[PDB]
Amino acid sequence: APSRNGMILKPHFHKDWQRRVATWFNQPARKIRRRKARQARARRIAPRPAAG
Amino acid sequence: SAHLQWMVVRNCSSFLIKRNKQTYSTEPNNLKARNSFRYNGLIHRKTVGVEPAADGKGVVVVMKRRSGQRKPATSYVRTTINKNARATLSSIRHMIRKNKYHPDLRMAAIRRASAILRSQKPVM
Amino acid sequence: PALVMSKGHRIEEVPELPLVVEDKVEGYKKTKEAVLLLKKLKAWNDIKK
Amino acid sequence: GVDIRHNKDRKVRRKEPKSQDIYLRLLVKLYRFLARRTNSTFNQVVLKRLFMSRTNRPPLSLSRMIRKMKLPGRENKTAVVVGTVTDDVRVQEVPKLKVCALRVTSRARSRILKAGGKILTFDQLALDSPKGRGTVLLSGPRKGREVYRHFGKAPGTPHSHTKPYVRSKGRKFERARGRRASRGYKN
Amino acid sequence: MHKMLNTDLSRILKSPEIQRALRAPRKKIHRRVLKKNPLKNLRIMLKLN
Amino acid sequence: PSRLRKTRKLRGHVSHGHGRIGKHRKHPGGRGNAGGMHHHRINFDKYHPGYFGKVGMRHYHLKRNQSFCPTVNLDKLWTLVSEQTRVNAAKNKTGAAPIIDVVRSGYYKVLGKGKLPKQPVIVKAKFFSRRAEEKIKGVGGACVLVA
Amino acid sequence: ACARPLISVYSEKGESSGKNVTLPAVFKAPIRPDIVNFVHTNLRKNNRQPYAVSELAGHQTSAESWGTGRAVARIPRVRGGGT
RNA sequence: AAAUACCGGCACGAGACCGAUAGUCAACAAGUACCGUAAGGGAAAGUUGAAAAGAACUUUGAAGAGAGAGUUCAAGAGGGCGUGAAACCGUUAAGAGGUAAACGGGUGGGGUCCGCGCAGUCCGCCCGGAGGAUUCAACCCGGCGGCGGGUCCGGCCGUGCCGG
RNA sequence: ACGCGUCCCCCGCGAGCGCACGGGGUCGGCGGCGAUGUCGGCUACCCACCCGACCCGUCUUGAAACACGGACCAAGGAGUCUAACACGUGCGCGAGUCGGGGGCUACGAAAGCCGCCGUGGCGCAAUGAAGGUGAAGGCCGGCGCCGCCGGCCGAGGUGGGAUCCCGAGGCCUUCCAGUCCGCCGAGGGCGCACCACCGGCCCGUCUCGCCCGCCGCGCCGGGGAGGUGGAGCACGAGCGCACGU
RNA sequence: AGAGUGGCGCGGACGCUACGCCGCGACGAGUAGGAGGGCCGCUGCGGUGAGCCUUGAAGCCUAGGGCGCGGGCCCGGGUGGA
């Protein structure tokens, strides 16, 4: 039962998108991992700056 | 300030009761345990509190001064009247009338003092 | 001050201050010194509750 | 059996505003007292504009405010604006005024405080004129939203001046059949 | 900004500037009257005629 | 909000607000745009006609970077530059016109819609309209082009 | 409001001190409980871990419905299963 | 090499997830028992007592199965032993039986038990009989608080004004 | 129908009282029986008798049906989420809002900050396939005359219209001229939102003739009047979140 | 309910949970479907009742009472032990 005047779209949900699911679980985990990697790099290069 | 915080207090509070179709407030300054704007002493500047003593000797009166704005303890002052009912109610009526301090609840304080002296009367 | 009594804290123990204590509070490193500070400020009934 | 149509038995207008704020409701309950005591229609119109919410009122513009103040017959006379007055940047000169409204934007407040205007609240205005003695009651232009281009006649119809719900207008979206005269027909 | 400055509606309403030009409060409760039959009852017919 | 829905109020119903005869079935009409030419023609061509067909030359490698060109009006010209220049423009008795750069604001073509106050300014842009040029030559001001 | 009283800052021993600092304007702020309750119900949801039911449970065991008759109520039942 | 993916495994932590027909099918000697010639299919299943203090002693009877004792706070926890729901059967007591049976309305009769009724609320003001309490109008001393010290003084405050 | 000082057509306060067919029931009248089986029992246990009384859900216009399923009971059990919209409601700032990605500082995978991290979305400007263009003008002089030197006013006009402003005057005390304040009002306008039309402007195009311009004097470029069509201008209003349909 | 210029005493109820109160009138059927309110109830999260009790928490029956126009609740008696 299609409704009255409105916008039209092409909802790409005909495929099995439940198979390929990749949602953002590790956003703050990736941020803390990049923070620790940057701190380890800054402690590795002692005279060199952060930019280089 | 006065009417502003009453709408917040009447919504949620620990002293208010909601059971058996009985919406009331159980504040200690609230006489007769009736929830109303006129029946309050914490918000208003003038506060009259009729309470019994620790022992069964008369009525203690908790008076509020002019300087009480943010003072929970040192604003209020306590006194104790240990006399008969006639001169006690006469002294309370003189405090209400001649001192001109909160001349609003006159008969309710009389009935409250009568109920307190009837309660602290020794049992048969 | 009415919302504190609506919450249920013992407001009677503080005579008059929206409590601001001196900068030597961070210098204490003992729980007995903390209990002594709470007894000097008389605010013990709220934690006894 | 009495044939009474009970369809329009209850008035569909609001008996109370649906907003949840403590500063508005006390003023509403005070203007209830003023509207029931004063016999004038001024407090009733102010109360009805307190019933009409943010979606039921348009934002008033400063350029049209100055344009309505340039009309004669209102010299040394204040204007009570219920809705919000938004700042319009296409203005250069501004005299001193006495602006009283609910919410005024910060650029307009800076311009009024630079010009030398006294901004006051509604309580002193109610103390000055309870019945509305020496006030001009104004309202903003309601025809100032995007949805009015969608209201009215249905599209896909000859002589229909109404914006259709198109996801993205362009060179190929709804141009070939219904618009051209060669490809079929046109309306 | 604050919506209203003086937040004391009782002090606003007890001011003489509002209470100068106002109508008097019609404080009189009017219950319904029992319409007695003037054909049966005697002195009701004497009242209205 | 499960308690703030109609599915708690409609507890105790057969079809849950979907009629006695015509129940809420799977697909009465179709799936999406099924049968758009046969029986949904009345539905689609009455509301949104025009999609069926080709039009124009098909431009394949289209880029919006060369086609991006925002315009600016003469009415909001004083809004970009600060108020001290508006003081100094009235202060200048000789008529030293201040420089107002349009490329700094990020616009290319200058149009004319509203009222401009009668004092000269220098406008540096890429394009200029003819009527806006007539208003600039009537009021006062130059038109410095840029590549 | 605009008027702000003077605050006598007490000492740590209990008695009052001589320092007096003017009260800030945050203590005369307008109160709005609705936005506070809305942000409270948002931030109390913004620290919640999701949970899931095992999706593969149910589709591993195979079954086939015989249809009408055979003293069943049109339910896909277990094929075989000598137990 | 660098930021990218991880549903299996090696070590953990946490949860607004579920709670013995639920949760992994499997919380226990679970792909285990079992079925099919085979690729294959696939179960049922927790709660004694804190502590076994697990019942010695007498009798009936071939033994099974009873009747008295003992333990413990209680067997009201008796070897398939947390508590003890309905559908179903029987027993003790009460009622009815020539228009299966039952229900809705009006009451009538008998009992189940409840009223702690079986000599039955009183309260304010005035007067009288004999009473008791050193107890009141009125006046000094000390302490506390409020109306407005109208027009006594000085600080403080103002999204006030005018300045240096 | 009932003292007179005050206008004829014509011969401004009395004191008390009794009782009431006078704005919805009272008695200032009464009697009995009760401490070992009587008093009250509507709710609930059983029985008797009077009236009514086709077995619950589905189908169809029409079902209690010789239309369908139902031996009984405990437990379980059947419009859920994301994405995209149309409308309604609440908050914030406002021509802006939004950090949803990035960086800096047990509960806390909480939280705070960035503004030269606003890179970027939306919208205040439309019309065309595109080459492109683009959203008022009016008044007075120099010149029966085209172009330009000057000054002034400025986002249109008419009608219906919320409410305000002014007021022909009025609003009672042994006497009369007589002051400011307060209320109402004959009548006249500025006219709020909104509605109806006439407009003016822009863009693609048809018809009509003419005027201008030059480092590059032409198959050059610009302009005027009347129509046609436009999801247009007529003085911003949207953005981000939460809920329901 | 106006204002000015001149010729013995020490007393008087309810009220106003202003999201409360009552006054005066009209009407009471209605499936599908839509709108509003539940001091109706189950299980969980953040606070709160100086909350509860081995001298009985929760759950199960009942010829006992009353509260309801309702979704339901309270104690009288038996089981029961956190």
DSSP-derived 3-state class of residue F135: helix
Q: What is the C-alpha to C-alpha distance for residues F75 and F79, in angstroms, rounded to an integer? A: 8
Query: Quick one: tokens of F97?
Result: 């016109």
Chain E: list its partners (3+ Cβ pairs within 8 Å).
Answer: B, D, G
Q: What string of DSSP letters covers G39-54?
A: HHHHHTTTT-------
Chain A contact set for D154 (CB, 8 A): 5
Scanning residues 43 through 82 of protein chain G, those with a beta carbon under 7 Å from any atom of strand H turn out to be 44-45, 48-49, 51, 53-54, 57-58, 60-63, 78-82
Asked if residue C12 keeps its beta carbon closer than 7 A to nucleic acid strand J, the reply is: no
Q: What string of DSSP letters covers F84-102?
A: HHHHHHHH-SS--PPEEEH
For residue D59, give every residue at least 6 positions away whose Cβ sits within 8 Å of its Cβ, in sequence order, or none.
D83, D84, D85, D86, D140, D144
Q: What is the C-alpha to C-alpha distance for residues F88 and F99, in angstroms, rounded to an integer? A: 12
For residue D187, give every residue at least 6 positions away whose Cβ sits within 8 Å of its Cβ, in sequence order, or none.
D156, D157, D158, D159, D160, D178, F49
Helices and strands (DSSP H and E) totals, chain A: 1, 0
Contact D175, A15 (CB under 8 A): no
Asked if residue B23 keeps its beta carbon closer than 7 A to nucleic acid strand J, the reply is: yes
Asked if residue E2 keeps its beta carbon closer than 7 A to nucleic acid strand H, the reply is: yes
Q: Output b/e per residue, D94-115; b: 16+ Cβ within 10 A.
A: eeebebbbeebeeebbebbeee
Looking at the partner chain, which of D90, D164, D176 has a beta carbon nearest the beta carbon of F55?
D176
- Angle value at C-alpha G45, between G42 and G46, nearest 5 degrees: 85
The end-to-end CA distance of chain A, in Å, is 63
* Reported structure resolution in angstroms: 3.2
Contact D44, D35 (CB under 8 A): yes
B3 interfaces chain E, CB cutoff of 8 Å? yes
The whole-angstrom distance between C41's CA and the closest CA on chain G is 6
F71 bridge partner residues = F109
Residue listed under structure tokens 């002294």: B91
Scanning residues 77 through 106 of protein chain B, those with a beta carbon under 7 Å from any atom of strand J turn out to be 90, 93-94, 97, 106
How would you classify residue G81: left for phi > 0, otherwise alpha for psi between -120 and 50, otherwise beta?
A: left
Cβ count near D80 (within 10 Å): 18
* C37 CA, H154 C1': Å apart: 38
CA D52, D58, D62, D65 dihedral sign is negative
The whole-angstrom distance between D80's CA and the closest CA on chain A is 40
Residue listed under structure tokens 């039009």: F55
> Please, is F94 exposed, middle or buried when counting C-beta atoms within 10 Å of its C-beta (0-12, 13-18, 19+)?
exposed
Best CA proximity match to B48, nearest among B64, B70, B71, B66: B64
Contact D140, D61 (CB under 8 A): yes
Q: Which residue is nearest to nucleotide H17 (CA to C1')?
A: G51
- State the DSSP code for D104: B
Q: What is the C-alpha to C-alpha distance for residues B87 and G76, in angstroms, rounded to an integer? A: 91
Q: What is the C-alpha to C-alpha distance for residues F48 and A8, in angstroms, rounded to an integer? A: 10
Query: Quick one: tokens of E1?
Result: 């900004």
| Chains D and A are touching, with contact defined as 3 or more CB–CB pairs separated by less than 8 Å | yes
Alpha carbons within 13 A on the beta-carbon side of F116? 23
Contact B104, B96 (CB under 8 A): no
Q: What is the C-alpha to C-alpha distance for residues B36 and B25, in angstroms, rounded to an integer? A: 8
Q: What are phi and psi of D45, to 5 degrees?
A: -70, -40
Q: What is the C-alpha to C-alpha distance for residues D102 and D114, in angstroms, rounded to an integer? A: 20
| Chains A and B are touching, with contact defined as 3 or more CB–CB pairs separated by less than 8 Å | no
For residue B48, give every residue at least 6 positions away whose Cβ sits within 8 Å of its Cβ, in sequence order, or none.
B41, B61, B63, B96, B101, B102, B105, B109
Q: What is the C-alpha to C-alpha distance for residues F50 and D155, in angstroms, rounded to an integer? A: 12
Query: For residue E16, what is the nearest residue in chain D, using CA coordinates?
Result: D127
G8 interfaces chain C, CB cutoff of 8 Å? yes
Tell me which of D160, D165, D169 to substitute to probe the interface with A (most A C-beta atoms closer than 10 Å).
Answer: D165
Query: Quick one: tokens of C29?
Result: 């490193």
For residue C44, give every residue at least 6 positions away whose Cβ sits within 8 Å of its Cβ, in sequence order, or none.
C13, C38
Q: What is the C-alpha to C-alpha distance for residues D185 and D178, in angstroms, rounded to an integer? A: 6
Chain E contact set for D126 (CB, 8 A): 12, 18
Best CA proximity match to B44, nearest among E11, E6, D124, G29: E11
3-state secondary structure chain C: CHHHHHHCCCCCCCCCCCCCCCHHHCCCCCHHHHHHHHHHCCCCHHHHC
The end-to-end CA distance of chain F, in Å, is 59
Cβ count near C29 (within 10 Å): 7
Asked if residue E24 keeps its beta carbon closer than 7 A to nucleic acid strand H, the reply is: no
Best CA proximity match to G61, nearest among G75, G77, G72: G77
Q: What is the C-alpha to C-alpha distance for residues D136 and C1, in angstroms, rounded to an integer? A: 42
* Strand I nucleotides within 7 Å of a protein CB: 20-24, 58-60, 79-91, 93-96, 101-105, 107-111, 125, 127, 129-130, 133-136, 154-156, 162-165, 182-184, 189-195, 222-223, 230-233, 235-238, 243-245
* A11 CA, I99 C1': Å apart: 28
Best CA proximity match to D48, nearest among D81, D12, D17: D17
Cβ count near C2 (within 10 Å): 16
CA F42 from centroid of its chain's CA atoms: 32
CA B37 from centroid of its chain's CA atoms: 13
DSSP-derived 3-state class of residue F72: strand
Query: Quick one: tokens of F33?
Result: 């745009």
Q: What are phi and psi of D128, to 5 degrees?
A: -75, -45
The end-to-end CA distance of chain C, in Å, is 19
Chain G: list its partners (3+ Cβ pairs within 8 Å).
Answer: B, C, D, E
